[PDB]
Every structure is written in structure tokens, then in C-alpha cells.
Nucleic acid binder design. Structure first.
Lengths: 119, 104, 175, 59
RNA sequence: CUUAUGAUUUGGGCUACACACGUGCUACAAUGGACAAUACAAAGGGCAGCGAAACCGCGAGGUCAAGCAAAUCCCAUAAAGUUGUUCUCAGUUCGGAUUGUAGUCUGCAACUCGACUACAUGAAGCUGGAAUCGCUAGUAAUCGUAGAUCAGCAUGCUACGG
RNA sequence: CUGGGGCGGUCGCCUCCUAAAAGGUAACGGAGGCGCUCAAAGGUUCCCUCAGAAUGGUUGGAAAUCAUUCAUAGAGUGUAAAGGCAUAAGGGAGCUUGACUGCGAGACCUACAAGUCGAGCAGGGUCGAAAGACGGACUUAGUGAUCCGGUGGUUCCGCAUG
């Protein structure tokens, strides 16, 4: 036999390691990343209170197409900033989850830098 | 195949594996070569007519492939003709006392 | 990737009717072939390793991974480093191109009657066939290779016990 | 998939006179003379073998 | 010594080998090598043995009769030589050890364990140290031919001439 | 120094134990190390996870290597031991030189000389998409005052002036 790992649990370990010197304090909050296989999820978390400030997703009805799965990630990064232009448009800390800064996690962050966020 | 020039062809084809004094008769049969063909022989249209007769022969290197496995078959059955290869034994029933040196 | 359909035939024609699986996903599936050659202690064979890394590319057309040592065991001359292995993990269609080649040319050139085993498993679904290098270079004959050798082919599947891995090896295999 | 480290391989049509079990590959980069259309349209340079002519087991 | 220390059988062995000394054979060449021609002997043998001239085989050789129990018939065309063409001075056309292919012949039978020839393969070996041996004329040196043993089998032996 | 003295041994730092659950604490008490090493064994960004155990497999030493499943660290961590550590401080890879300059609030330690840790501030960089991380190695040994001398700098002095 051979046991196939799931890609979420390894990701979780990696993310846990990443997210020990990475925190949001509501003057510089944190957006993290959860891409699954179809949809990219972004979310501004203030790590001090444990209270979020914003939320965006590739499966939400405002941004739901079948474009590339990368241009969908560009639409979500455009979405999380224009909701964070309602409040707290200052610097944030990008949290890559446990994923590389490449492809869909990169296009989520390239889109947020060119749409008002200053990270 | 890889024969040398500047010598006579009755001794030149001997230099490859698988020919000794058959080029005097058997290669001389099919090809219309002569005895005094040096490097200056123009054997390029004659290269084709020797290629047809050497293609039937096992000579150029490929005979040593079959010759090697004939010993390998002979030791695998473990015959007395074959044990003498794997053991320095003269093989063809010779006296293995003092004057048996070329097999060591 | 022509004869990959041999597996796609036997998943639903024999394996659904043998064990009576409840879904097509949990049929036993082969995942990797590693062709780990072995050690060949290179006090001199580091030059024969350059032949041994050349022979295994001709068997399977992927470059081997020259696996080095791990410990400092005495009565053996080796340290950390000292590359004493080679393997190729065959994952994709090169597996089936190697599998649907080898199982027709393994039993004939070995000159064995039965040929491999009736059992070689580890109680989990892994075979680990052992080869004394009597099969390879079937295209260019015994012309330029130098030293006799011995391979090792491991078949890693998603079988669960021995008798389900006997079923995958009963497709043009000889136990 | 990496360029540079791989040797050559192709769909080697194993041209055997007994049923032509052409599901093989390797490094037979030789003269392409006759390529069967049901098989690998490449060199037929596997000219003769004892592969699937007479198995010792399924004799 | 006397149910063996004597017998009788086919099967081994006397032929084994990391080696060490005796005795010889063939050599390490261009006063040679390979191919063509062309001479000249002596001695001895032949009680189903020697077996010609023909053939049929690349050859080792097979098929019958020709002669004969032999100064006549056969073994048997001695060879080195001589004549010509060759290679060119290299472990090259020098020699041919050793291994697979012919299955030739003898013999109940050639695996241990024979004898050649057939195409392959072609190794040591460039005239040998200290030492040591033979030999005073048809002798050293070389060249080939015979016979005894023997169904088959000598690089030995014994005789023979050049 | 010394259970008189001599002889033997010892003399500086590091790590334990003795040490009595803070620190500290002696003996010629019990154990050991050091008088370095590294241009990657430093920096930084990325990935990565071990020993061992079975099991079964051309090498098969039991044990090299391959695969599976268990494996909490039992591995490893330049070097003694003790604390550490899978945030990996362990293991790879890519770029690099922060193994920077000027400082340092504060604190530890302590008879003094010494010794240690530092946020932060400029300066000027490296790595990283970025936040950031970088003032040497997982931490704790690898040394020795002053005086004198050498050498290189130096807007300082230099005897009446230069």
C-alpha cells in the first residue's frame, strides 16, 4: 500500500510555522489566504482581538465567473481592498497561508497592491 | 569496416576480426579485385561489392559476441570442457604440469 | 500510453467481480515503480557507477538519483556522501510503457521455468522483484556494456493485503 | 519532463512476427522502415524477440 | 599372506597442479616468409598387409578393381636446393601457442584421455645474465625419409642418406 | 598549595555531580573538556523531516542500498558535558556578506579591575513580493593586564621661527 497525504494538513503545518512571527494588530492588520481547488478566499483578520474586518471569496455572487482561476484571484484581491477602503485602508501584513507566493496566491496579492492597499 | 590502407589487400582484410587468408580466395571470388591493390586502389565502387560478400560473414566483431556466449553456455551447464574455462586450466585435455603456461 | 487500457479493462471486468468492491475508486491501483539498482560498493566502482548510471538510463529513459550513504558502518568502506546507489521512480505513463514491456521480456530471457515467485509480498501490497540483469538493452545487443550487474524492481500499489495485489499481478504476470 | 537530462525514447513498435506485441520503448534510434498504424508510428527496430512467441509458463 | 596381500569384472586413475629442476621440439626471420615452377637420394617395410593409376572431397580422406606374399608391385613426388614473382627491416605476409566451428579415421567405445586439417582466433617471443654442454671431416651444424613397437598415436628411440 | 614537611600531584578557563526544589557554597571530593575550528559550519528567503523497528527485495556481511508501515525526537545539532530545539537551533537549495559604522535607555554580574545582555537611534547595506530579518556559528570554553617595541593612519603637539 501507500498512504496519500492530504494537502490541507501539510499546508496547515506550514501555515502554523509561518504565522508565529506574522500578526495583525488593527493598525497593521492581516489578510490571509485559503485557496482550495476552485475558489480563493481572502480575509482581513485582526489577530489581537481575534476579530475580522473584511472577507472576500471566489464563490461569492459579486465575483463568480469561470475566467482562469487566476483572474478569479485577481477579482478577489480587487474585492478585499475596496471593502477595506471602507475602513482601515492602511498597511496590512500579507499572510500566504501555507502556500507559495506564486500563481493564485500571488495574483491575489498583486491585485491588492494595485487597488489601494499599501503592503 | 575499419581496414588499414597502404598495404596489399590480401593482407589488409586480415586486420579485422574474423578473416585470415580467406581474402585471398573467398573475397577474391565475389569481388573482381587484384593482389597489388595498395592505398591507391580506388576501392569505392569495389567497396560496395565487398560489402555484399562481407554481409554474409559473421566476421567484423559480431563473431566475438557469439564466441563469448558459447563459453558462457558451456560454463552454465558446468561441463568438464566448461569448468576448465572458469578454473588457469588448459581445456582440451592437456598435461597441466610445468609446460602449461599460456593459460596460467 | 497505448496499453494503459489493459488496466482500465481489468478494473471493471475482473476486479469488480472478484472482491465485489462498492465503488470504482477503491480498486487496487499501481502508483510507482522504483528500479533501485542496489549498492555495488564503490571502492573502485565509482567509474563503474558512471557505467551503472548509463545502463539504467537505457532501461528506463530517466536519469537515476545517485543515493549516498547515511551512516559510518565499519567492516565497510563508506562515509556520508560516497554515492552507493541509483534509483528511478516511474510514476506516469512511463510505468506502463515499462511494465507492458518488461513482463513480456522478463520470463523469456531469464531462462527460468516458473520465473519470479508465487509470493514475494510484504503483507501490504508491494512486490520487490529481484533481477540479475539478464533482460536489459533488448535493442542494442551485447556490444559495449562492460560489467555484469543486478537490478531490483519494486512494484508499489494501492492494494491492501497480499491477495488483492495478486489480482493486479495476474494481468499478464506469471506467478 | 526536464530538458537536458533525459535520453531518447519513442513508441518502439516491437515488430515481432508472432502477433507483434508493440507496447515497448527504449533507445533503438535506428532505421525506420515500416510503421504499423495501429502501433507506434516510429522505427520498427525491434526486429526479433522471444517476448510473446512461446511463454515458458503459458506454453 | 590363504573368504585373501590371491581372484573376477566396467568405472576411474597412471594424463591432477600456486609450482621447482632435467631433456628435447618449434621459434624469435628479409643468408628469411608466402606462391608458383623444376631436380637429385639412401635405408627399410608390405602372412587380408602395402594398396597404385582413376575419381569424388577445400583438406584430413572415402569407393572398387591394377598389380604381390616381391632387385620387378606398392608405401614414395624425399626435403633443404635451384628458378621466378613477391612483402620491405615491427610483436608487420615474422610463429600459430590457446580457444569455438569439420565431425576425417582407427577402433564395443575418443567425456575424462587420442591422431590430424577446415575455416576462425591469434598470446609469450627480437637471439637470452651468471654459468654450462656437445663436437677434430663427411664430423659440428642442418634437411627430410624409414623401421621396431602398434587397431589408433613420438617433438622420443633406432637406422638412413642430402 | 599540602591532614607536618619532602616526594608525587596541582595551579587558567568550560561543563556537570556533590549543592540541602532561588542564587551562592569547601575538600589532595566524584566526572570530563579547552589554549580551537568554519568564507559557509555566517546572513537571508524558500522548501524538507529523523533514529530505530518490523516487513521483503538483482548487491545480500547480521547490518550498505530500495520500498511499505509504525515510529516524540530515541536522530541530528564543528568540538567536553549540561541545558536546549521538529517555532526547528536539524537537513537541502537560491541569492548574498550584518563575521556593518557611530552609538546606546536599561539590566545582569561583581571587592576592584574586569565580564555579560540589550530594546532602540542614526548611517549605509544584504535577503525577501512584502511584513520584516540581519552588529557571526543552538547557548555556555578556544586565552594574558600594564609597561616597552614594531607597523599604518592621524585637521594633535612639536621648545625663537619654518
Amino acid at each position: 500500500m501507500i498512504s496519500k497525504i492530504d494537502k490541507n494538513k501539510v499546508r496547515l503545518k506550514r501555515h502554523a510555522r509561518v504565522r508565529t512571527n506574522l500578526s495583525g494588530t488593527a493598525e497593521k492588520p492581516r489578510l490571509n489566504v485559503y485557496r482550495s481547488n476552485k475558489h480563493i478566499y481572502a480575509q482581513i483578520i485582526d489577530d489581537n482581538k481575534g476579530v475580522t474586518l473584511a472577507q472576500a471569496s471566489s464563490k461569492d455572487s459579486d465575483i463568480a465567473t469561470t475566467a482562469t482561476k487566476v483572474e478569479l484571484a485577481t477579482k478577489v484581491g480587487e474585492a478585499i481592498a475596496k471593502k477595506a477602503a471602507d475602513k482601515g485602508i492602511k498597511e496590512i501584513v500579507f499572510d500566504r497561508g501555507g502556500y507559495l507566493y506564486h500563481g493564485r496566491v500571488k495574483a491575489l496579492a498583486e491585485a491588492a497592491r494595485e487597488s489601494g492597499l499599501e503592503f | 569496416v575499419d581496414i588499414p590502407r597502404e598495404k596489399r589487400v590480401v593482407i589488409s582484410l586480415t586486420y579485422i576480426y574474423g578473416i585470415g587468408t580467406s581474402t585471398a580466395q573467398k573475397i577474391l571470388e565475389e569481388a573482381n579485385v587484384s593482389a597489388d591493390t595498395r592505398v591507391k586502389d580506388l576501392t569505392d565502387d569495389e567497396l560496395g561489392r565487398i560489402r555484399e560478400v562481407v554481409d554474409g560473414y559473421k566476421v567484423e566483431g559480431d563473431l566475438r559476441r557469439e564466441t563469448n556466449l558459447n563459453i558462457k553456455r558451456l560454463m552454465e551447464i558446468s561441463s568438464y570442457r566448461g569448468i576448465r574455462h572458469r578454473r588457469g586450466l588448459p581445456v582440451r585435455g592437456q598435461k597441466t604440469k610445468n609446460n602449461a603456461r599460456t593459460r596460467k | 500510453n497505448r496499453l494503459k487500457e489493459k488496466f482500465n479493462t481489468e478494473v471493471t471486468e475482473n476486479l469488480m467481480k472478484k472482491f465485489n468492491y462498492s465503488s470504482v475508486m477503491e480498486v487496487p491501483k499501481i502508483d510507482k515503480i522504483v528500479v533501485n539498482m542496489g549498492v555495488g560498493d564503490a571502492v573502485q566502482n565509482s567509474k563503474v557507477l558512471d557505467n551503472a548510471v548509463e545502463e539504467l538510463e537505457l532501461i528506463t529513459g530517466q536519469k537515476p538519483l545517485v543515493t549516498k550513504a547515511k551512516k559510518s558502518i565499519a567492516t565497510f568502506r563508506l562515509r556520508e556522501g560516497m554515492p552507493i546507489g541509483a534509483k528511478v521512480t516511474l510514476r506516469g505513463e512511463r510505468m506502463y510503457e515499462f511494465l507492458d514491456k518488461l513482463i513480456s521480456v522478463s520470463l523469456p530471457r531469464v531462462r527460468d521455468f516458473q520465473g519470479v515467485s508465487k509470493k514475494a509480498f510484504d503483507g501490504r501490497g508491494n512486490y520487490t522483484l529481484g533481477v540479475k540483469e539478464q533482460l536489459i538493452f533488448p535493442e542494442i545487443d551485447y556490444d559495449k556494456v562492460s560489467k555484469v550487474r543486478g537490478m531490483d524492481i519494486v512494484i508499489v500499489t494501492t492494494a491492501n493485503t497480499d491477495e488483492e495485489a495478486r489480482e493486479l499481478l495476474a494481468n499478464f504476470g506469471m506467478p | 519532463m526536464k530538458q537536458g537530462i533525459h535520453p531518447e525514447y519513442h513508441q518502439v513498435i516491437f515488430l515481432d512476427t508472432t502477433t507483434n506485441f508493440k507496447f515497448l520503448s527504449g533507445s533503438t534510434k535506428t532505421s525506420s522502415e515500416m510503421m504499423e498504424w495501429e502501433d507506434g508510428k516510429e522505427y520498427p527496430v525491434i526486429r526479433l524477440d522471444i517476448s510473446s512467441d512461446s511463454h515458458p509458463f503459458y506454453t
